[PDB]
Design an enzyme around this catalytic site. Structure first.
Site, short mmCIF file in Angstrom:
data_model
loop_
_atom_site.label_atom_id
_atom_site.label_comp_id
_atom_site.label_asym_id
_atom_site.label_seq_id
_atom_site.Cartn_x
_atom_site.Cartn_y
_atom_site.Cartn_z
N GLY H 30 2.94 25.83 9.40
CA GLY H 30 2.04 26.19 10.52
C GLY H 30 1.50 24.99 11.27
N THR H 31 0.78 25.26 12.36
CA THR H 31 0.06 24.28 13.23
C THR H 31 -0.92 23.45 12.40
OG1 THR H 31 0.26 25.09 15.47
CG2 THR H 31 -1.94 24.40 14.80
N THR H 32 -1.30 22.26 12.89
CA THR H 32 -2.30 21.36 12.25
C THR H 32 -3.71 21.70 12.77
OG1 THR H 32 -2.86 19.10 11.65
CG2 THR H 32 -1.95 19.39 13.85
N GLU H 47 -4.55 22.27 16.91
CA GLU H 47 -3.38 22.13 17.82
C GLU H 47 -2.94 23.54 18.24
OE1 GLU H 47 1.23 20.43 17.38
OE2 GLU H 47 0.17 21.29 15.65
#
Ligand SMILES: *C(=O)[C@H]1NC[C@@](C)(O)[C@](O)([C@H](CC2CCCCC2)NC(=O)[C@H](Cc2ccc(OC)cc2)NC(=O)[C@H](CCO)NC(=O)CN2CCOCC2)O[C@@H]1C
Ligand SMILES: [Cl-]
Ligand SMILES: [Cl-]
Ligand SMILES: [Cl-]
Ligand SMILES: [Mg+2]
Ligand SMILES: [Mg+2]
Ligand SMILES: [Mg+2]
Ligand SMILES: [Mg+2]
Lengths: 204, 250, 221, 243, 196, 244, 233, 244
Positions: H30-32, H47
């Site tokens: 997944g996204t940070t 993000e």
């Protein structure tokens, strides 16, 4: 209105010398109308005797219930139930219906088969145990029976004498109650044998 | 969430074996040796206190448990399984008998109630059988003294004497030699201590041995006086001292 | 009439032995002193069946709890279990109890009302004879009573009930619970109401009663 | 056939593999804990390891205050540790309300052990991969140590140790109690009982401890409390002026 | 019943009479109406003894479980739990409860919960059958930030008047002082407070 | 999910058989043999105790012959624990009928009810069947002396003589050989013992390995009497028949 | 690999994937193409209806949820009926209780949370349909893309179903043009018809084949089918 | 054997739960997203991968508020995160209803902790496919937490999870060392913007959108608020300046 006063009826139990006696009237009525002159209020499960007064439908229901429970007891325990044990079964059975009770006045009578000790007991409709050494009374003429028993009774009466005492206690109490009488039956219970006698009494 | 295991985990195999019951009996066999001997005037039940560490206090773990004042229980197999069975056994003695008849159940009927609980763990959804065999010793007025074995299957049998667990095969053989229908309770304790010495590897004393009797009424252990009919409990657990006294006459 | 009195090394409870249906005496010698646990005793007033049932239930649960915890039953446990049960039924279980006993934490004396209210005291009384008994207790009670003084005071308090209250009569039952020793239950500690010998024997001459039909009953199966 | 290792049913050898693997999870944290009984106190020492510099050291704890009197140290993953903690706290509160006295250490221990036993017999519940060490000064039994495991086993201890290097700490304490001939630390102040526990922790593990390397809990008459970093430092200074 | 709680400079003081009556009979003349729900959170009970005891027992349970998880609860938090029980069960409860506690940040606080189950935060609160007679006296004599000696006097004078007029009130005047110092139990016997 | 570990105890084989019922019958085939024989003037129940010891208390022991009613008994073959669950429910059904109609339950009605409970575990619930086969020996005033059998399938049938448990094939042949319709109880007692004696997997047929029961209408009464034989009584009848 | 971790939705793969969810997403790509696009004033749905035979009807693709909100489906029609029926109730609840038209953003959040519950519990299956929700609420025109995974995204324009990448590239290019078609519904629909026609291949969009819906400033959500779409072919 | 990773609640021979460790892979995919604990509050940043120009800028919000004082951001399966915050909101409402005071951050942390841990106890549920960073201001100071799919959580000075967690953690570690006296709320917002821009380099193929929120005692009165307009641009510019 009062379910204990619709059908009528009485039971009395007494202890003697190595014997007990339990007696009852035969009347089943609906208020003033007498319907049956053969309605017995004493039942036995082995050597333990139970007399029940009050609402007749509950008398019949409890008889069928205690036959049911004592039959299962005998199959599991592999022995007949004792008066002291049966007394506790009646008590717990009645208190189970605390907030919807059976409108009855039960009376246990019998001789402990092992100790040979005479035993009687009485209950209220929600199953409070009344354990007396002398006598127990129940029914629409309980006041009358209390008066007769308290006067006539003496300890350690022989079976033949105890018969005369319980018979006179029942008969004279019944003849002062509108809803009791119409014939009577007396049980004389000894260790070995039990004699059942139908009394000649007033049919009014 | 929710127990979705509504199906039996114990099923008949093509051979007609019930796997989980057989495997439970295997777990019982691995357990420490426990035995029971019935005398004319009492019953004795004994086991070894296998301390899991010398830092552990063996006294704070009772392998021998009072169920009713006239009934005692000992086991072989899984300790936790035994502990919850004792809790259920004590409660069912009240709910299913004492709260109805106003007296404690006779040995055979309480045994019958424990047997039922263990049978249900054999058939009910999403459970394994209990990994213990019980030895239940008790007295009641109309049957006198009795000794019962209860297996994971739910099956129970009355015994004059028997053993279960590790060295049961050898212990049962030694009891067959020494048992007669004229044994006094003290003779049965002596035979019990002899039989258990063959099972124990290490230290054999009152601190490593747990032994209880179903004998005479103990009015001193009742905790109150004034009711003649109440004479006290027939179950008594022997003290560390009382065992060592009988070990010097071994 | 039931009372509880604390002395310096324990607690005593006492009660009369009259059971009544309305104005009629049902039992002349019924025991109102019940055992919850060996060293926790209970005196009951109100609905007879209710006091007996609630005492047996909590007594049963206290035993199971005592086996589970491997400890002596505590009075505060019997108290909490009785009050929470009686409260749940909003007073429809008409049980009025004086619960007393000794346990590891010392001696205790409490009263429990039907709606689930509890009181703590050195001297208590409940029943129809409550006020007759409490009058004697408020007159004679002092701090640091002996065992023999506490029994005397408790006994005197029940006698006040027996004589002056119609609800109460017959005999005095006492149970002493001392911190050190076993609880001693003194069934009929006093019998000051013995029936005088009757003026006549009412033994009937055999054959007095008329019988219609006779038969032997079958007991054996 | 091969699913006798996935759920808590018996293997042909009469074994529960899920219970044995649950025991293996208890060492996942690589933390060693010991408990010792004083004259009138009970002390628990646990290793405190904070690898990440971003972590708040104050929030990292495997010692829990269950009630006013009972403390519990856990050996195992923190999610299972906190599951067991909340349940013990709930059971301690409920007991007090229903029975009118503070739940004893050994009764909570038995109760938590009985819960663990149910996961050992019911398929849909997994065992918690934790070992719970309960400590208090019980108002009947005095200083008390009672330990439960995923099997549902429990027992009282004179002293105990849990974790990877359990056996080294165990034998160290054993040898002390063979020598002293008593079943407790003969000391009036709890401070010296804590100093003893840290001393024998160092001797057995063969490691020196700073103030942030240890985590201490003390049970006394009517209270259980954990030591701050500065309370431990004062304790570490005392043992230093003896060696 | 006569009960009151008074905030002062150092914290708060709870006061109560010791009389429980069933009709005109004094069932208990040494009742303790000052009930602990936490170390430094106490309540005064008024109304049904059964109801107020059942509630207090449940609150003590809730705050013990609160403490186990989230540490020392605020006096406001305790009052909120009392409220929640009283309000949500208003049809089956006859309970009037004053909640008083000492916080180190908030000092002394008093919350009163009448029959309805509403909550009212006050400098001081009076309740029970005997309170009707001392509304006049208490309003005229109460000052904020009194001393310990002054506050004990205010409660002793107030409850003595309530006891004097109310038949449902009497016995001893129990007090419970809540400050940073700790918890102090005070008792005042008739032979003292009657002759004020 | 949980689907992975489901045995599916209530499914059909490609041949149209119930796996668990078939494997449960295989279990019972290893249990101690039990025989019922109906005569003109009564019924006999005889059962062989599977596994015994010198230290097994036989006097207080019952593992095969159980009393359901004052007029109905059962011989068990299979799991004792499973049988006691069904026996307890059967005892209750008999008392429910008596409470309802004020008449003792007819034998078939009791048998059908127990058989219907077994059928339930066969069609729904996903539980294992009861590893039990019953021989019902009973009397009622409609059909007189009756002998029934029920098995884990929930199927029941009536018999003049029948065996369940171990070596039923051998036992059924010997009964079919020596049985006659005009038989007396005393003849049936002998036949039952002779059959067990020849089907036994043990050395000799001794008293300590037997349970015996008769349901007779003792001529000097006019009522039905159940007699579960005591150890000494089994030892006696064993010598009289000529097995010593 | 995949065969062992696709038995149910309650199972993660070793790479951290939910195959039952991905298989449900596959049912969308097999579904007939539908396009959504909005300006500042109006939002338009253009859906290509699919027929079984030349004797069968072209199955309806657009469902009205309220007077201000509606959606186009791609995948299992019954699952679209269930989700649209749920959204109808949430729009209905908002009106009756709060006298408030349900915000399109909040309609998305509710569909997301309902889809999610079918992806974490045993016995359940993911929804096998993708939805394009349009609506004019208090914050102007809105277009949402719903995926059975539970992922809901607010967009200017998009397309889902078979060859949907054709329309999606066109809209990604036409963005700056159609966003400014304010107060002209006919030009926004024509821009949506030019979008969907970028995903044709089989046939050309006919009269009983094309399905168009519009919502906006002073336009209640209304569906145009047959003769009514003849002026856009 | 094997198959220990096919069922949720199953222990592997090395005392691990593979289904939980597989959920961690969904998070890492997944996204940070990050959290920074400043001297009197906490800052959350994430993000947002711009798939296409069709995504409406500033509309698809990811950071969620619990009560009015707690911020929650997560990495992995967004629906699973929403489901956890839905529970968190019910949990915070329950607390406030009984105890009046808004839920403390540690109290709230354990509430999420116990719920996530519960989804590792049974095979009938799937573990959470999100690592959640959350916190805010309560009675006694600011608190920042990170919660793993196992149910594991701790307090943090700084936290990071998802694609570029190493880049983030490395940049957070530098701040903890170079600011022992503590970072300010204003500074932490700028600093959070930089760390997201630096951690985006692990996904530099796709263009992204920055989203920041904060809960400061001095700057937002201890309420969770989103960074918008001037202060957002000021933070974007600070990052865009220090990326070169
Ligand atoms: C001292 O104060 C004694 N005063 C006497 C008395 C009678 O008030 C009593 O409380 C006594 C308590 C004992 C009796 C013996 C067994 C243990 C308990 N109470 C009774 O005997 C009780 C009186 C009573 C009757 C009815 C009601 O509610 C209407 C309240 C009190 N008697 C009964 O309960 C009789 C059973 C006697 O065998 N039961 C009934 O009359 C049946 N009704 C019960 C209520 O529900 C409807 C049916 O002793 C104290 C200590
Ligand atoms: Cl438990
Ligand atoms: Cl009170
Ligand atoms: Cl009041
Ligand atoms: Mg008459
Ligand atoms: Mg007439
Ligand atoms: Mg399991
Ligand atoms: Mg006054």
């Amino acid at each position: 209105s009062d379910p204990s006063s619709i059908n009528g009826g009485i039971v009395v139990a007494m202890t003697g010398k190595d014997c007990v006696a339990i007696a009852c009237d035969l009347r089943l009525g609906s208020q003033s109308l007498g319907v049956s002159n053969k309605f017995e209020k004493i039942f036995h499960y082995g050597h333990v005797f139970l007399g029940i007064t009050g609402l007749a439908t509950d008398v019949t229901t409890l008889n069928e219930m205690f036959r049911y429970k004592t039959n299962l007891y005998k199959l599991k325990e592999e022995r007949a139930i004792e008066p002291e044990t049966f007394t506790q079964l009646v008590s717990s059975s009645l208190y189970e219906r605390r907030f919807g009770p059976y409108f009855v006045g039960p009376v246990v009578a019998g001789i402990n088969s092992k100790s040979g000790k005479p035993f009687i007991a009485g209950f209220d409709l929600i199953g409070c145990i009344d354990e007396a050494k002398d006598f127990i009374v129940s029914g629409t003429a309980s006041d009358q029976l209390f008066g007769m028993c308290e006067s006539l009774y003496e300890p350690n009466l022989e079976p033949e004498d105890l018969f005369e005492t319980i018979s006179q206690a029942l008969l004279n109490a019944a003849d002062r109650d509108a809803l009791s009488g119409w014939g009577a039956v007396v049980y004389i219970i000894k260790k070995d044998e039990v004699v059942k006698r139908y009394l000649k009494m007033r049919q009014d | 969430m929710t127990d979705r295991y509504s199906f039996s985990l114990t099923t008949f195999s093509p051979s007609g074996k019930l796997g989980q019951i057989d495997y439970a009996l295997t777990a019982v066999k691995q357990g420490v040796t426990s035995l029971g001997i019935k005398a004319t005037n009492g019953v004795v039940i004994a086991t070894e206190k296998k301390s899991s560490s010398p830092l552990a206090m063996s006294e704070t773990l009772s392998k021998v448990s009072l169920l009713t004042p006239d009934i005692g229980a000992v086991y072989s197999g899984m300790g936790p399984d035994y502990r919850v069975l004792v809790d259920k056994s004590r409660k069912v003695a009240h709910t299913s008998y004492k709260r109805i008849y106003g007296e404690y159940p006779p040995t055979k009927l309480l045994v019958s109630e424990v047997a039922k609980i263990m049978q249900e763990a054999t058939q009910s959804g999403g459970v394994r059988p209990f990994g213990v065999s019980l030895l239940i010793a008790g007295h009641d007025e109309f049957n006198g003294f009795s000794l019962y074995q209860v297996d994971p299957s739910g099956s129970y049998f009355p015994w004059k004497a028997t053993a279960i667990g590790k060295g049961s095969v050898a212990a049962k053989t030694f009891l067959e030699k020494r048992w007669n229908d004229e044994l006094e309770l003290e003779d049965a304790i002596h035979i019990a201590l002899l039989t258990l010495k063959e099972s124990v590897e290490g230290e054999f004393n009152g601190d490593t041995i747990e032994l209880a009797i179903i004998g005479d009424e103990n009015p001193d252990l009742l905790g109150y006086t004034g009711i003649p009919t109440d004479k006290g409990p027939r179950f008594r657990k022997l003290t560390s001292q009382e065992i060592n006294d009988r070990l010097e006459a071994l | 009439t039931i009372v509880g009195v604390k002395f310096n090394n324990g607690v005593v409870i006492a009660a009369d032995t009259r059971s009544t249906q309305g104005p009629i005496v049902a039992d002349k010698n019924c025991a109102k002193l019940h055992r919850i646990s060996p060293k926790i005793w209970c005196a009951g007033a109100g609905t007879a069946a209710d006091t007996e049932a609630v005492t047996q239930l909590i007594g049963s649960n206290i035993e199971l709890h005592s086996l589970y915890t491997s400890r002596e039953p505590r009075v505060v446990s019997a108290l909490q279990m009785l009050k929470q049960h009686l409260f749940k039924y909003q007073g429809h279980i008409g049980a009025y109890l004086i619960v007393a006993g000794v346990d590891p934490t010392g001696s205790h004396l409490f009263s429990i009302h039907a709606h689930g209210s509890t009181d703590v005291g050195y001297y208590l009384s409940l029943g129809s004879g409550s006020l007759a008994a409490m009058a004697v207790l408020e007159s004679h009670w002092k701090q640091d009573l002996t065992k023999e003084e506490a029994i005397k005071l408790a006994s005197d308090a029940i006698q006040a009930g027996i004589w002056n209250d119609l609800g109460s009569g017959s005999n005095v039952d006492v149970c002493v619970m001392e911190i050190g020793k076993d609880a001693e239950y003194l069934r009929n500690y006093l019998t000051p109401n013995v029936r005088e010998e009757k003026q006549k024997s009412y033994k009937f001459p055999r054959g007095t009663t008329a019988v219609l039909k006779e038969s032997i009953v079958n007991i054996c199966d | 056939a091969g699913y006798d290792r996935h759920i808590t049913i018996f293997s042909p050898e009469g074994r529960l593999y899920q219970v044995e693997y649950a025991f293996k999870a208890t060492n996942q944290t690589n933390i060693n804990s010991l408990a010792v009984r004083g004259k009138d106190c009970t002390v628990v020492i646990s290793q405190k390891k904070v690898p990440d510099k971003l972590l708040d050291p104050t929030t990292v704890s495997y010692i829990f205050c269950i009630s006013r009197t009972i403390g519990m140290v856990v050996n195992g993953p923190i999610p299972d540790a906190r599951n067991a903690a909340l349940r013990a706290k709930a059971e301690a509160a409920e007991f007090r309300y229903k029975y009118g006295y503070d739940m004893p250490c050994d009764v909570l221990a038995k109760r938590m052990a009985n819960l663990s036993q149910i996961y050992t017999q019911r398929a849909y519940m997994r065992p918690l991969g934790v070992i719970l060490t309960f400590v208090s000064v019980d108002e009947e039994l005095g200083p008390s140590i009672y330990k439960t495991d995923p099997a549902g086993y429990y027992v009282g201890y004179k002293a105990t140790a849990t974790g990877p290097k359990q056996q080294e700490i165990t034998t160290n304490l054993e040898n002390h109690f063979k020598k002293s001939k008593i079943d407790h630390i003969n000391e009036e102040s709890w401070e010296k009982v804590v100093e003893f526990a840290i001393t024998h922790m160092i001797d057995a593990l063969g490691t020196e401890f700073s103030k942030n390397d240890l985590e201490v809990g003390v049970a006394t008459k009517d209270k259980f409390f954990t030591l701050s970093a500065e309370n431990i430092e004062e304790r570490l200074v005392a043992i230093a002026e003896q060696d | 019943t006569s009960i009151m709680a008074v905030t002062f400079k150092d914290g708060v003081i709870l006061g109560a009479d010791s009389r429980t009556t069933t009709g005109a009979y004094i069932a208990n003349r040494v009742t303790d109406k000052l009930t602990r729900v936490h170390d430094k959170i106490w309540c005064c009970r008024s109304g049904s003894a059964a109801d107020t005891q059942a509630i207090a027992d449940i609150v003590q349970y809730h705050l013990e479980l609160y403490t186990s998880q989230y540490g020392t609860p605020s006096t406001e938090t305790a009052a909120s739990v009392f409220k929640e029980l009283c309000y949500e069960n208003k049809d089956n409860l006859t309970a009037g409860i004053i909640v008083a506690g000492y916080d180190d940040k908030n000092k002394g606080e008093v919350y009163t919960i009448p029959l309805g189950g509403s909550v009212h935060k006050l400098p001081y609160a009076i309740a029970g059958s005997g309170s009707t007679f001392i509304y006049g006296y208490c309003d005229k004599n109460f000052r904020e930030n009194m001393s310990k000696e002054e506050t004990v006097d205010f409660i002793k004078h107030s409850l003595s008047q309530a006891i004097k007029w109310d038949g449902s009130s009497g016995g001893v005047i129990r007090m419970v002082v809540l400050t940073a110092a700790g918890v102090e139990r005070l008792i005042f016997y008739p032979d003292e407070y009657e002759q004020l | 999910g949980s689907r992975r570990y489901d045995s599916r105890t209530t499914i059909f084989s490609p041949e149209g058989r119930l796996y668990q019922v078939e494997y449960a019958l295989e279990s019972i085939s290893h249990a101690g043999t039990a025989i019922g024989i109906m005569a003109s003037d009564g019924i006999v129940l005889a059962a062989e105790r599977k596994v015994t010891s010198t230290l097994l208390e036989q006097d207080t022991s019952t593992e095969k012959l159980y009393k359901l009613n004052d007029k109905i008994a059962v011989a068990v073959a299979g799991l004792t624990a499973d049988a006691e669950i069904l026996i307890n429910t059967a005892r209750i059904h008999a008392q429910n009928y008596l409470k309802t109609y004020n008449e003792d339950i007819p034998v078939e009605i009791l048998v059908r009810r127990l058989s219907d409970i077994k059928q339930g575990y066969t069609q729904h619930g996903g539980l294992r069947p009861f590893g039990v086969s019953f021989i019902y020996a009973g009397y009622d005033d409609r059909y007189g002396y009756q002998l029934y059998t029920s098995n884990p399938s929930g199927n029941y049938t009536g018999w003049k003589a029948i065996s369940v448990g171990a070596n039923t094939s051998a036992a059924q042949t010997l009964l079919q050989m020596d049985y006659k319709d005009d038989m007396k109880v005393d003849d049936a007692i002998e036949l039952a013992l002779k059959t067990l004696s020849k089907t036994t997997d043990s050395s000799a047929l001794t008293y300590d390995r037997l349970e015996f029961a008769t349901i007779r209408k003792g001529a000097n009464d006019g009522e039905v009497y159940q007699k579960i034989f005591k150890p000494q009584e089994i030892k006696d009848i064993l010598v009289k028949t000529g097995i010593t | 690999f995949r065969n062992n971790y696709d038995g149910d939705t309650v199972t993660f793969s070793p790479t951290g994937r939910l195959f039952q969810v991905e298989y449900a997403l596959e049912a969308i790509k097999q579904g007939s193409v539908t396009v959504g696009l909005r300006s500042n004033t109006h939002a338009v749905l253009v859906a290509l209806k699919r027929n079984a035979d030349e004797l069968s009807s072209y199955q309806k693709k657009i469902i009205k949820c309220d007077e201000h909100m509606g959606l186009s489906l791609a995948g299992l029609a019954p699952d679209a009926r269930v989700l649209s029926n749920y959204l109808r109730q949430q729009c209905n609840y908002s009106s009756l209780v709060f006298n408030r038209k349900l915000a399109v953003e909040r309609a998305g959040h509710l569909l997301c949370d309902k889809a999610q519950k079918n992806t974490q519990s045993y016995g359940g299956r993911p929804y096998g349909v993708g939805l394009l929700i349009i609506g004019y609420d208090k914050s102007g025109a809105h277009l949402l893309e719903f995926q059975p995974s539970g992922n809901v995204t607010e967009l200017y324009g998009t397309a889902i179903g078979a060859r949907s990448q054709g329309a999606k590239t066109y809209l990604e290019r036409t963005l700056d043009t159609f966003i400014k078609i304010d107060g002209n519904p006919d030009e926004l629909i024509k821009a949506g018809v030019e979008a969907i026609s970028q995903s044709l291949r089989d046939e050309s969009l006919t009269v009983d084949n094309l399905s168009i819906a519009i919502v906006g400033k002073d336009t209640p959500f209304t569906i145009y089918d047959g003769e009514a779409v003849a002026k856009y072919i | 054997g094997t198959g220990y990773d096919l069922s949720n609640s199953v222990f592997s021979p090395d005392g691990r739960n593979f289904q939980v460790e597989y959920a961690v892979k969904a998070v890492e995919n997944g996204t940070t997203s990050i959290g920074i604990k400043c001297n009197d509050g906490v800052v959350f940043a994430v993000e947002k991968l711009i798939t296409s120009k069709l995504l409406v800028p500033q509309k698809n919000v990811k950071i969620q508020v619990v009560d009015r004082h707690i911020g929650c951001v997560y990495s992995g399966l967004i629906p699973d995160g929403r489901h956890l915050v839905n529970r968190g909101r019910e949990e915070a409402a329950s607390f406030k209803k009984l105890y009046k005071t808004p839920i403390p951050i540690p109290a709230f942390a354990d509430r999420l902790g116990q719920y996530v841990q519960a989804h590792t106890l049974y095979n009938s549920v799937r573990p959470f496919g999100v690592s959640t960073i959350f916190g805010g201001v309560d009675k006694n100071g600011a608190h920042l937490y990170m919660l793993e799919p196992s149910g594991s959580y701790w307090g943090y000075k700084g936290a990071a999870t998802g694609k570029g967690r190493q880049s983030a953690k490395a940049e957070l570690e530098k701040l903890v060392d170079h600011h022992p006296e503590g970072l300010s709320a204003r500074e932490a917002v700028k600093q959070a913007a930089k760390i997201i821009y630096l951690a985006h380099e692990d996904n530099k193929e796709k263009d992204f959108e920055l989203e920041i929120s904060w809960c400061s005692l001095s700057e937002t009165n201890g309420l969770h608020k989103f960074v918008k307009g001037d202060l957002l641009q000021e933070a974007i510019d600070f990052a865009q300046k220090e990326i070169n």
